[PDB]
Amino acid sequence: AAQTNAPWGLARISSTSPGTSTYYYDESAGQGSCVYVIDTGIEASHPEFEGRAQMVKTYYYSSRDGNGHGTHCAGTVGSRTYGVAKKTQLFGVKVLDDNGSGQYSTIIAGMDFVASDKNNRNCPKGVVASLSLGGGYSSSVNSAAARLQSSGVMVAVAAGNNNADARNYSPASEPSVCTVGASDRYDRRSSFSNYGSVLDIFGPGTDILSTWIGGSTRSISGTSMATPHVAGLAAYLMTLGKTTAASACRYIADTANKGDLSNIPFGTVNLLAYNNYQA
Ligand SMILES: [Ca+2]
Structure with missing residues (x-):
């Protein structure tokens, strides 16, 4: 499958090269997998989630995402x-x-x-x-x-x-x-991104368009934004049978784009998450 005019980060994780705007992926699209988002909550009623999101736990007076x-x-x-x-x-x-x-x-x-x-x-x-x-x-x-x-x-x-x-x-x-x-x-490594031998993988984190509360959208930056790309990619690969929960980090690193990033400090991996999809 192909989604044209996708956010750059989706295009990037299905490409060997930067600078393209189409997201290529298998139509299975993570069906039968589950992803827990441990955070400020989720506006489950957002049309973009199509009934596939729900709040299961809160530690506050409400389960509502009042942040975004x-x-x-x-x-x-x-x-x-x-x-x-x-x-x-x-x-x-x-x-x-x-x-x-x-x-x-x-x-x-x-x-x-x-x-x-x-x-x-x-x-x-x-x-x-x-x-x-x-x-x-x-x-x-x-x-x-x-x-x-x-x-x-x-x-x-x-x-x-x-x-x-x-x-x-x-x-x-x-x-x-x-x-x-x-x-x-x-x-480039995002200017704020932490680094070090403990990193396993990089994903798109600067200027990422996604859902926001009030049924809206916006672009924001952080390692917070890179993390869900990798979480989503793991769910996608597990649906396809390519890997398991125990092995998925290793599989993502093994199949990543290697050597493509700049401003990587010596000792940090130069690995960018990639879905290896060939239509
Ligand atoms: Ca690790």
Whole structure:
């Protein structure tokens, strides 16, 4: 399948070269997979989600996304227009308040929730969790991310936006999960993207168009935006039978575009997520 005039980031993950605007993908489009978006929530009523999104948990007085960030990330995973995996099921877990903040104990609770909750959902092709959040190093937070991964969920995490080594941020620094940096439409590392030997992969993170609250859309930047590209790609590949939750990060790195990025510090991988689709 081909979607013309796609957001640049969708075009980029289905291309060997920058500078094109068509997203090429298998029509299966992540059907039968599930993706948990652990964030500020999801505006499930947004037309772009077509009834495929729902809120399953909150730790606040409401499950509503009063911020926008979680809706945007969910949009990049699985919205009809802006998403990688256009037929995936999206589940929202609201660990961040409407200011975008959360205590680590809440975030930890949210990750352990997903490890259990996946047993209550129909996801025959596999389960992914997308975590577009972080903060300073915490062994407790890393341990929670490692447990979620161990439980059979592909965990994709944002590297952070400090232009620093991601080894000092959590859960970015947990080795067993898939830590995602950000690139721009000219194949440069995004200027804010963290880096380091703990990164596994880069995805599109600068000027990413997706869903927003109030039934709207907007373009924003961050490793928060790169992470859902990789989460959506994992869901897509698992539907196709190419990989599993345990192996998906490795498979994505093995099949990535290699050596195409600029401004990669020595010691950081030069790997850009790629869906390997040949129509
Ligand atoms: Ca890793």
